[PDB]
Design an enzyme around this catalytic site. Structure first.
Site, PDB file in Angstrom:
ATOM      1  N   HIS A  43       0.722  -1.303   0.037  1.00  0.00           N
ATOM      2  CA  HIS A  43      -0.076  -0.040   0.041  1.00  0.00           C
ATOM      3  C   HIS A  43       0.688   1.397  -0.090  1.00  0.00           C
ATOM      4  O   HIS A  43       0.041   2.463   0.038  1.00  0.00           O
ATOM      5  CB  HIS A  43      -0.833   0.142   1.062  1.00  0.00           C
ATOM      6  CG  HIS A  43      -0.497   0.137   2.527  1.00  0.00           C
ATOM      7  ND1 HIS A  43      -0.627  -0.673   3.567  1.00  0.00           N
ATOM      8  CD2 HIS A  43       0.070   1.236   3.312  1.00  0.00           C
ATOM      9  CE1 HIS A  43      -0.158  -0.263   4.710  1.00  0.00           C
ATOM     10  NE2 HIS A  43       0.549   0.793   4.275  1.00  0.00           N
ATOM     11  N   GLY A 145       2.759   5.453  10.726  1.00  0.00           N
ATOM     12  CA  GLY A 145       4.296   5.329  10.195  1.00  0.00           C
ATOM     13  C   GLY A 145       4.924   4.033  10.624  1.00  0.00           C
ATOM     14  O   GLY A 145       6.017   3.792  10.201  1.00  0.00           O
ATOM     15  N   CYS A 147       3.774   1.226   9.699  1.00  0.00           N
ATOM     16  CA  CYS A 147       3.700  -0.060   8.683  1.00  0.00           C
ATOM     17  C   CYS A 147       4.950  -0.320   8.277  1.00  0.00           C
ATOM     18  O   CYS A 147       5.929   0.281   8.006  1.00  0.00           O
ATOM     19  CB  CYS A 147       2.731   0.322   7.539  1.00  0.00           C
ATOM     20  SG  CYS A 147       0.982   0.503   8.280  1.00  0.00           S
TER      21      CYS A 147
HETATM   22  C1  LIG Z   1       0.585   2.232   8.389  1.00  0.00           C
HETATM   23  O1  LIG Z   1       1.791   2.828   9.020  1.00  0.00           O
HETATM   24  C2  LIG Z   1      -0.772   2.458   9.281  1.00  0.00           C
HETATM   25  C3  LIG Z   1      -0.518   1.822  10.738  1.00  0.00           C
HETATM   26  C4  LIG Z   1      -1.838   2.248  11.683  1.00  0.00           C
HETATM   27  C5  LIG Z   1      -2.036   3.736  12.127  1.00  0.00           C
HETATM   28  C6  LIG Z   1      -2.545   3.340  13.515  1.00  0.00           C
HETATM   29  N1  LIG Z   1      -2.276   2.199  13.903  1.00  0.00           N
HETATM   30  C7  LIG Z   1      -1.719   1.473  12.951  1.00  0.00           C
HETATM   31  O2  LIG Z   1      -1.274   0.252  13.105  1.00  0.00           O
HETATM   32  N2  LIG Z   1      -1.622   1.711   8.607  1.00  0.00           N
HETATM   33  C8  LIG Z   1      -2.890   2.446   8.178  1.00  0.00           C
HETATM   34  O3  LIG Z   1      -2.883   3.661   8.319  1.00  0.00           O
HETATM   35  C9  LIG Z   1      -3.823   1.771   7.391  1.00  0.00           C
HETATM   36  C10 LIG Z   1      -3.364   2.319   5.625  1.00  0.00           C
HETATM   37  C11 LIG Z   1      -4.301   1.484   4.578  1.00  0.00           C
HETATM   38  C12 LIG Z   1      -3.616   1.951   3.274  1.00  0.00           C
HETATM   39  C13 LIG Z   1      -4.708   1.359   2.274  1.00  0.00           C
HETATM   40  C14 LIG Z   1      -4.925  -0.166   2.164  1.00  0.00           C
HETATM   41  C15 LIG Z   1      -5.337  -0.618   3.723  1.00  0.00           C
HETATM   42  C16 LIG Z   1      -4.522  -0.098   5.002  1.00  0.00           C
HETATM   43  N3  LIG Z   1      -5.272   2.205   7.671  1.00  0.00           N
HETATM   44  C17 LIG Z   1      -5.629   1.443   8.689  1.00  0.00           C
HETATM   45  O4  LIG Z   1      -5.168   0.690   9.359  1.00  0.00           O
HETATM   46  O5  LIG Z   1      -7.035   2.076   8.824  1.00  0.00           O
HETATM   47  C18 LIG Z   1      -7.858   0.868   9.330  1.00  0.00           C
HETATM   48  C19 LIG Z   1      -9.319   1.552   9.806  1.00  0.00           C
HETATM   49  C20 LIG Z   1     -10.151   0.146  10.103  1.00  0.00           C
HETATM   50  C21 LIG Z   1     -10.216  -0.934   9.300  1.00  0.00           C
HETATM   51  F1  LIG Z   1     -10.994  -2.004   9.830  1.00  0.00           F
HETATM   52  F2  LIG Z   1     -11.011  -0.572   8.122  1.00  0.00           F
HETATM   53  C22 LIG Z   1      -8.764  -1.375   8.733  1.00  0.00           C
HETATM   54  C23 LIG Z   1      -8.128  -0.013   8.311  1.00  0.00           C
END
Ligand SMILES: *[C@H](O)[C@H](C[C@@H]1CCNC1=O)NC(=O)[C@H](CC1CCCCC1)NC(=O)OC1CCC(F)(F)CC1
Ligand SMILES: *[C@H](O)[C@H](C[C@@H]1CCNC1=O)NC(=O)[C@H](CC1CCCCC1)NC(=O)OC1CCC(F)(F)CC1
Lengths: 299, 302
Positions: A43, A145, A147
């Protein structure tokens, strides 16, 4: 008497030397630099526009090697290849990581512990131990950040990489990929509401914890009564416990203590509905995040 | 909602590159190799029959530079000098550790947390985080061979070395030395039963934990009512709490939440008795092992 059973992580040195930062257009996150390969979550290819339902095939086709930049903060790396494997990118770079440890790739099963090196912008910031939950999520501490942070176990100086962090669910728990590219727990790498299944007690870990208790001088809950593996696993279906599955590790604990696994299975049936005023290792609830291997190692 | 408030240690690689094995006769333990110096517990000089009241001063005079063998595993290092500083030996070796981190030697105070790199035969085997308790003991996991394992924090690029492991007490807790050579607490490096003082709840850490609860959406325990710091501290003397001393880190939790320290000092006085069927961050008792710095980092990222 403090049992000395604590949440313990592997030394992170060997992995810290593999962590890099990966950028693609506007997105940046962490990757894992082994030999001439940099692993990161795919992603990194998504713009902020389209996080709800990314088209990863179209995104990848649109990319060239020059679309990705890899930098080391924990060297001068140029991307000479790019490919997808499941939810991960496998980038090829021109310089081999001189500090690549001996490693393998493993997919952990629920109940198993592994260490996470939490990273931000390719800089290691913290390390902690997590248990893969029976609903295939993990707890731990992950912020924006993080990921691309990786989870791993160790056998000797051999690191078994097992997790690359991808996302947080609405309940605050987390999931990621194995390095075969599959997401733990079938979750999709789409920013679309997805529901964790219910969590269960990790039976084999609970047993190890009570063995730990017995080894620390706390055995009031050991009676002569027994419950079989097979009977217990039928009881577990109905009471939010996993299937019990014996190991060489758990058998060591039975030999050390003189207490058989079947005695503790019975013990768990009784303790499930309460400790009735008593404590075990400072808890009033069964604990399931210490594995048999933890108790053997630390006691 | 999972807080994300976990036991978290510093990445231990900077410190792994400094761990060596130090051998003196029968005894073997770990040492810490910084530039041209190897630090280790002085009881490595001690023969097994004389551990109850060792004469360290005479043991040291009797040694030569060849009495100490130092081995890296994570080369052999030649000992070219030896000296005693409090409960630690300061060995001088003829090779400067090419991977020495920027470092300091600061003794930590009760309630402060640090990371431990548990080692055996100079080989790093695990890392965990501990809180220096008001009775100058730590919990953690230490077995035979762990002596000389070190505890540290990292502030910026600078590692602060604050603990070198020496012994396990009868209740299973552990203590050791600061790198100025003092032992934490009253303790002495004699294998004898020693009286450890009564433990206490670390007030400032309990406040940080309540702030973490507020930040995570759980503030049922917050009232307008307040208890001042001086009044709380007088109450603390009689109820097994440390004096509360505020810091900039705690002030930030107060700014971010809108809740004043004094409201949480009042709450602590009511929650000490018990939570009466409620929970705070999956706990039914007060937690005093997370610092304000932990909460700022793990919940807010600062
Ligand atoms: C990447 O660093 C980040 C890690 C997150 C931030 C807060 N705690 C974490 O572990 N990941 C994301 O922000 C992630 C990004 C998206 C990008 C497009 C493809 C899918 C992942 N978004 C995310 O984790 O949001 C959640 C919201 C609730 C959900 F069930 F829908 C899953 C996604
Ligand atoms: C050094 O590696 C070792 C670490 C100990 C062993 C068990 N768990 C630990 O953390 N330290 C000792 O064994 C220590 C050495 C003596 C030698 C003379 C100078 C002072 C210290 N002795 C010690 O910890 O004794 C304890 C053993 C555990 C006990 F419960 F039985 C009480 C005495």
């Amino acid at each position: 008497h403090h049992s000395g059973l604590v949440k313990m992580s592997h030394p992170s040195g060997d992995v810290e030397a593999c962590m890099v930062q990966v950028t693609c257009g506007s997105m940046t996150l962490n990757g894992l630099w082994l030999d001439n390969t940099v692993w990161c979550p795919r992603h990194v290819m998504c713009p902020a526009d389209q996080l709800s339902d990314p088209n990863y095939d179209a995104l990848l086709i649109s990319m060239t090697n020059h679309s990705f930049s890899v930098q080391k903060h924990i060297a001068n790396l140029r991307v000479v290849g790019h490919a997808m494997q499941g939810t991960l990118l496998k980038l090829t770079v021109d310089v081999a990581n001189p500090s690549t440890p001996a490693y393998t790739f493993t997919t952990v099963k629920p109940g198993a512990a592994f260490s996470v090196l939490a990273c931000y912008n390719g800089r290691p910031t913290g390390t902690f131990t997590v248990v893969m939950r029976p609903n295939y999520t993990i707890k731990g501490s992950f912020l924006c950040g993080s990921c691309g942070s990786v989870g791993y176990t160790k056998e000797g100086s051999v690191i078994n990489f097992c997790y690359m962090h991808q996302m947080e669910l609405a309940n605050g728990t987390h999931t990621g990929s194995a390095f075969d590219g599959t997401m733990y727990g079938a979750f999709m790498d789409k920013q679309v509401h997805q529901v964790q299944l219910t969590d269960k007690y990790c039976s084999v870990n609970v047993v190890a914890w009570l063995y730990a208790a017995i080894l620390n001088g706390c055995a009031w809950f050991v009676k002569p009564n027994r419950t079989s593996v097979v009977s217990f696993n039928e009881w577990a279906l109905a009471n939010q416990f996993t299937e019990f599955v014996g190991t060489q590790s758990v058998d060591m604990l039975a030999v050390k203590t003189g207490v058989a696994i079947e005695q503790l299975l019975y013990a768990i049936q009784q303790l499930y509905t309460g400790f009735q005023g008593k404590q075990i290792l400072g808890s009033t609830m069964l604990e399931d995040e210490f594995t048999p291997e933890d108790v053997n190692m630390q006691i």
